[PDB]
């Protein structure tokens, strides 16, 4: 009865802008907002993740609960897909972009509350954005030279690792480090080339123990065990290692090849047969002087006889990413046949050994001052399981934004714990205060969005979010004797945990953001939010 | 008088669902409107998203449940095979048509007498387009003024940034294409290409063809200044014998060099390929040598083609080879045995692009390609979609005013001027009938939903952009002069179009206004809805 | 933002209510106007139902829900007293004049906007009623032109037959009370009297007074010619001994003879007033002589009378005696022991009508009666109810215009003049706003609702009609020439009212246009209704 206007697509309740899709679709990612506004800064929130199949892990992670989180509402996926975009070419930012574009949003809901469209909005938004990114390239104070020192990449390697894992960081910032400056090489000015490919650097956890026995290893290691006797090699420089990718057994015929047996003759010949190729396939292995042999598949009886005669090392290695993997650091090519690894092909490991991390026994592949791995492996430990498991994806966060420092100025660095964040929101103010008109609203609002970096990192530390951010402010909105300003563009927030009062100077503890996270996020949280800005209906069809 | 399982509206309730239904699809696609209108979200049901504003994809990517708006939606999607714009403008103008000729029906105005007043008045409409359309110059040389022509037709479209980027790609792709001597153009020789991991913002206009499948060997050449084409359908992939045959060996030395023996016919093919190369530009400086092999190549002659400084692509896809030997003017060679230098092509710069997951080769700078690419660049699945339609919507705005060269300065001044003609020509030639002049007063008043959508989704005040628009016009009428007057959507007051830059097409307008007029008519001369085993 | 027990209703949907609520009203009284009306039935559920066109009744007695068209039908029953008409001239103007005001505020135009346009155009159609209206004559003997004027006022309320019979009796009772001096005029002079037992037709004017108690004896004249007129406030009844008494006697036939004695006291009051007539033209030819006592006559008293042919009347109510000094110039006597031949009055024929069940004196033919009564004749009350109010108003009508010599040509003649005036004059000017003019826009178009209105009651096509109006009118006015174009209802054509005799009041419409243009307003300027305690 209850007649309805308006709705004539598939009997579909489509809101139009009258009805408010925009402040709706903006109240749907409020909920997502919230739960990653706890996430960011070195005292951020744990969440727990049940997968569907039955795997309950805790991380402190935004991107990785939005990976988990089976996302429906449009007006939250077009902020998912900011986050990948963080993801793509960047290693970090996720929650810079997620916590700002939220933010963004919110104030846009107070303007439209006041009658400024939706379209005036979104210019302001965007011009705005464009002043963002010039001023950020003035706020430079060092740079990163690229000379691939260890001291230089834990300045970087620190901060990144801090909001993933608290309280390791110095710890796990020289696992990282020594692992990116064993793989990265000894060079300067040289950007014509690219180099340091993030899956250069594993990590492998063992369950029990502590990060205090952690280490690095300078080659690769594997969860197989030596199958065949010899479970080591010798104390020598260069042993000659064959890789195979055809399991090291009889060869088989292409079509049919099915051996029938009558006679109790044809056994006794069939077996010599066998016997003797196998032999004679590890025997042109031996006799090119290999003293490990790597299969990508099993190993035969026979062969196995065989190669423990030889005195040849063997070892499983089933996942094609790790057979590629060692080719990086004995140089041997996988052989698509067997009984011929021509010498070109094999490759040289002055060391490989079993070892024990955690009570687990691996094999490891390894060369030390000498004839150096182009990959490098980050051993932790750890008995808690849900801990372990981020520690693992704190070491991976590490090497990713090392790979952020990239030619086009990716060195630069600015002050961090919200020391930016502060500054733009004096900066951008004053563009909207000189820009005339209507634009000056959004431009100001734009500014606003952005204490919620400063808030964000004060209640997390359990401060008092309405004594630190006026003192942050009163920080920054000081007298200098000059123009420009110099002591106060440091000032940041103190994640202390303390009592009273106060900031702390990012020069105390080396705080720096990269520009190019800056402006990259810079770049996406306004796109995400002016996107679900332009949306004032969604409407579903079949395509 | 109805049978069962069956359902009709004999009383005028026949018209009000026709009405509202036709206002419910008005108000939605009319904030679509303009460069300051908003974008639709379209849901797959899938999960996937795809945001617009193009009306014909608005309309025939969404569902509808009205009877009647589906007959709307279908009759001004047809204009996207008639001028490939208007879409939107049309459902806004039925719309608009049906809401004035139903005030009239409601004071008795019979249909019939609303329907002879549309046709009376469209007639006088495409007069008075044919007097208001400006004649373009007859030269293609003029950059400047198709820039203006691509540069409206995005703004509709994209987000005004992008726009700068796009602008001078779909002006200068359709030009590249357009025949000497002020022939004709087909836009379909702009190939529109969509690449991932890069901003849209990337966008860029390529000369020649981009292929998918690049070298395969790290010494490949990475650039090479001026090279010759070989266009081969010859396989070099190792080969074995034609006929049953086997390899016999008692040693592995035999065995390999049995194997070997035949490989040898893949290597003689490649010395007559390599000869050629030496025979051309063998030595010569800045010069190298392409192969965009159809089939498979082994490794091994990727090896031997890479020492040689050759670059070696290969399975090619039938479109890039049947293209390629145009834009380099090579010939297919499908036996090696009678390769000669008469095979060859010629291209300029020739390099791959290394992008995280692909490589692209570019086959650019040739002496007739006769053929442009677009790379539309994007991260995510609807950027890449809104970017693609706002490309191939400017290339279609260009190539129609080069075609047509009829231009109509646009932000309102046709429907604004039209609107105020229609109203003074009723009245000075009483043409019609004392009571058919309720039609042309109601299609007059139609036509300014155009301009009051456009502007009221700039958010200014629509009452006021019309009334100064009307001021100006007074002004001109009155000194006896020819003036276009608009609204600026972005300053509120009045504009001269001709000066911002702001045209539209002829043959959008001429059957924007007639398939609009038509579509009411039809809906309006409805007298039943008939419903029966539905 | 809601208290319980209050409503606060926003979103523009007090605007929508109040519309929606005039519209109702506008359709109640819209089937009610001009001679084609219809009917309307109104029961007072204890089984009287009362028949009328009377917008005044039928506004007072319609019981009304919606809250807005109380405000309406109110500030109209104010506007009834103030014009004495047009009472559904204003509802039908202020609903047209909601219905288009809310068309244009649906498109952005704000409510003040509209109501400023609105009392600029009222301004402008007050400047054009006084170039409109025609000075009538002042001589009284305008009997002719009056004529007109009652049918214009009774054809509207009656069933066009009946108008036959109340145009000689509207026009000649006001003019017979009508002084031909500059003096006054006071309709309260013609006295509104209802009787049953006749038919509608035979609605009669009467010089003189009626009154109800006639004659109780059979030989008293029904007919009285040239009649003395005695007006006597003291009962001659049966009267007894002053004081306490008895009759003390010895002999039967004694009894009856003291009685008679005490029968003297009334006697003697008999002989002086039979001694009145015999001092005061006795015996003279064509002189008769009529009692009006206001107390009662004693059987035998009137018997006394009835032997000398005098009429003698009893028991009479005030009301008629003391008009009665003042029509037949005698003077009342509070008793007969004051009784002077100077006191009688003098009349023409005072007859006795008689009836089934009722008796009425008539006293006409007097020298200066100041004083007239009109006799409404009906079998029910339906009849009696609609002819009550068409000589009411009637009377008004007609005294209105001998009072204000201010006449206006009717037929719609007026307001759709002030629709073209408006239009012309608001293109003419633009003196407003580029925003009010909306407003005069909507003014002037609304005005048409009661040509309009007229017509389609008509049966005629008003989308016909008042085009042929609007033509002949151009016409007049392309000729250099006067001329009055109105509404012909019962051809269908055009005609000049002050030919054909269709008139309208200067001061009802003159209000009609003032009241209703502040109506609209006052309901336009509701942003929100405000609901609490309820």
Same mark, same amino acid.
Request: glycine share 8%; aromatic share 4%; charged share 25%.
């Given at each position: ?74 007006? &939250?996926?077009?902020?998912?897909? @900011? ?37 005036? *909005? ?18 430079? &104070? ?40 064993? &793989? ?237 964040? *502060? ?29 919620? &970096? ?61 520009? @190019? ?27 | ?145 198709? %820039? ?6 995005? %703004? ?379």
């Amino acid at each position: 009865q209850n007649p309805n206007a308006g709705l004539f697509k598939q009997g579909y309740n489509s809101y139009s802008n009258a009805d408010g899709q925009i402040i709706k679709s903006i109240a749907a990612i409020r909920e997502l907002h919230q739960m990653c506004l706890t996430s960011m800064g070195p005292c951020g929130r744990n969440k727990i993740i049940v997968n569907h199949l039955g795997k309950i892990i805790i991380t402190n992670d935004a991107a990785t609960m939005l990976r988990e989180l089976d996302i429906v509402h449009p007006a &939250v996926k077009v902020l998912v897909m @900011a986050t990948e975009q963080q993801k793509i070419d960047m290693g970090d930012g996720t929650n810079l972009v997620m916590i700002l574009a939220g933010e963004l949003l919110n104030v846009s809901e107070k303007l439209i509350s006041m009658g400024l469209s939706a379209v005036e *909005i979104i210019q302001g938004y965007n011009m705005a954005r464009k002043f963002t990114l010039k001023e950020l390239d003035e706020m430079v &104070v060092g740079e990163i030279t690229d000379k691939n020192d260890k001291n230089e990449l834990l300045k970087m390697i620190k901060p990144v690792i801090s909001s993933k894992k608290y309280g390791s960081e110095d710890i796990l910032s020289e696992l990282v480090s020594e692992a990116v400056s064993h &793989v990265l090489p000894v060079a300067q000015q040289a950007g014509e080339i690219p180099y340091f490919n993030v899956d250069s650097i594993r990590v492998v956890k063992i369950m029990g123990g502590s990060l205090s026995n952690s280490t690095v290893i300078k080659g690769m290691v594997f969860n197989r065990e030596p199958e065949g006797h010899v479970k080591s090699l010798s104390e020598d420089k260069k042993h000659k290692v064959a890789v195979f990718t055809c399991p090291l057994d009889i060869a088989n015929t292409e079509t049919k090849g099915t051996v029938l047996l009558h006679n109790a003759q044809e056994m006794l010949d069939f077996s010599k047969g066998e016997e003797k190729q196998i032999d004679a396939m590890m025997k042109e292995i031996a006799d090119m002087g290999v003293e490990c042999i790597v299969a990508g598949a099993g190993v035969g009886e026979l062969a196995l006889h065989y190669l423990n005669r030889y005195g040849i090392l063997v070892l499983k290695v089933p996942s094609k990413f790790e057979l590629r993997r060692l080719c990086r650091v004995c140089g041997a090519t996988p052989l698509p046949r067997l009984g011929a690894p021509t010498p070109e092909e094999l490759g040289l490991v002055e060391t490989v050994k079993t070892m024990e991390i955690g009570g687990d026994r691996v094999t490891v592949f390894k060369q030390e001052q000498g004839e150096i791995s182009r990959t490098s492996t980050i051993i932790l430990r750890g008995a808690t399981q849900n801990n372990l498991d981020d520690i693992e994806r704190a070491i991976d966060d590490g090497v990713a934004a090392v790979k952020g420092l990239m030619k086009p100025s990716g060195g630069k660095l600015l002050p961090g714990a919200g020391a930016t964040e *502060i500054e733009l929101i004096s900066r951008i103010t004053k563009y909207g205060e000189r820009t005339p008109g209507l634009l000056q609203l959004a431009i100001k609002q734009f500014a606003v969005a952005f204490e919620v &970096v400063p808030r964000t990192l004060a209640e997390t530390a359990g401060l008092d979010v309405n004594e630190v951010l006026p003192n942050l402010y009163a920080a920054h909105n000081v007298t200098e004797p000059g123009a420009v300003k110099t002591d106060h563009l440091y000032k940041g927030v103190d994640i202390d945990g303390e009592s009273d009062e106060g900031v702390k100077d990012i020069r105390e503890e080396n705080i720096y953001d990269m520009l @190019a996270t800056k402006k990259f996020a810079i770049n996406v949280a306004t796109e995400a939010a002016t996107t679900v800005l332009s949306i004032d209906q969604i409407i579903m069809a079949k395509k | 008088l109805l049978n069962p399982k069956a359902e009709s509206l004999r009383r005028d309730a026949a018209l009000k669902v026709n009405v509202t239904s036709a206002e419910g699809l008005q108000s939605v696609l009319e904030t679509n409107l303009g460069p300051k209108g908003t974008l639709k979200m379209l849901v797959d049901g899938a999960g996937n998203i795809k945001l617009t504003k193009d009306g014909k994809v608005l309309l025939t990517e969404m569902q509808i449940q009205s009877p009647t708006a589906v007959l709307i939606a279908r009759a001004a999607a047809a204009q996207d095979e008639i001028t490939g714009d208007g879409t939107t403008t049309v459902v806004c103008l039925v719309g608009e048509l049906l809401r004035q000729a139903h005030r009239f029906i409601q004071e008795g105005v019979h249909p019939r007498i609303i329907t002879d007043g549309f046709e009376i008045a469209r007639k006088e409409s495409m007069k008075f387009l044919d007097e208001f359309k400006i004649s373009k110059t007859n030269l293609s040389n003029d950059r400047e003024f198709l %820039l203006q022509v691509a540069r409206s037709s995005l %703004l509709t479209k994209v987000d005004a940034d992008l726009t700068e980027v796009l602008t001078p790609i779909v002006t200068d792709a359709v030009l590249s294409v357009y025949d000497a001597q002020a022939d004709n153009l087909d836009l379909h020789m702009v190939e529109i290409m969509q690449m991932q991991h890069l901003s849209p913002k990337d966008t860029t206009f390529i000369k020649g063809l981009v292929l998918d499948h690049g070298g395969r060997h790290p010494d490949m050449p990475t650039r090479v200044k001026n090279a010759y084409v070989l266009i081969l359908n010859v396989s070099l992939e190792y080969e074995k014998t034609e006929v049953n045959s086997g390899f016999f060996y008692s040693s592995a030395d035999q065995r390999d060099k049995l194997a070997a023996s035949e490989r040898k016919f893949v290597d003689a093919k490649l010395k007559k390929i390599i000869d050629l190369k030496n025979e051309v530009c063998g030595m010569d400086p800045d010069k190298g040598f392409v192969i965009i092999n159809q089939k498979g190549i082994d490794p091994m002659s990727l090896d031997v083609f890479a020492k040689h400084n050759i670059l070696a692509l290969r399975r090619a896809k039938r479109r890039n080879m049947e293209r390629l030997q145009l834009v380099t003017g090579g010939e297919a060679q499908n036996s090696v045995e009678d390769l000669s230098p008469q095979i060859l092509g010629f291209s300029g710069l020739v390099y791959q692009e290394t992008i995280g997951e692909e490589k692209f080769t570019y086959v650019t700078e040739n002496t007739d390609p006769k053929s442009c690419t677009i790379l539309i660049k994007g991260s995510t699945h609807y950027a890449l979609a809104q970017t693609k339609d706002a490309v191939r919507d400017g290339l279609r705005a260009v190539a129609n005013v080069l075609k047509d060269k009829n231009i109509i300065p646009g932000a309102g001044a046709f429907y604004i001027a039209l609107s105020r003609y229609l109203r003074s020509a009723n009245m000075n030639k009483l043409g019609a009938k004392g009571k058919t002049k309720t039609g042309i007063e109601a299609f007059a008043e139609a036509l300014l939903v155009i301009p009051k959508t456009l502007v009221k989704n700039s958010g200014f005040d629509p009452l006021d952009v019309l009334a100064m628009v009307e001021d100006e016009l007074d002004d001109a009428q009155d000194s006896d002069e020819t003036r276009y007057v608009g609204v600026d959507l972005n300053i509120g007051d009045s504009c001269d179009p001709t000066i911002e830059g702001i045209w539209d097409s002829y043959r959008v307008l001429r059957n924007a206004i007639t398939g609009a007029t038509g579509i009411a008519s039809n809906l309006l001369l409805c007298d039943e809805l008939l419903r029966a085993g539905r």
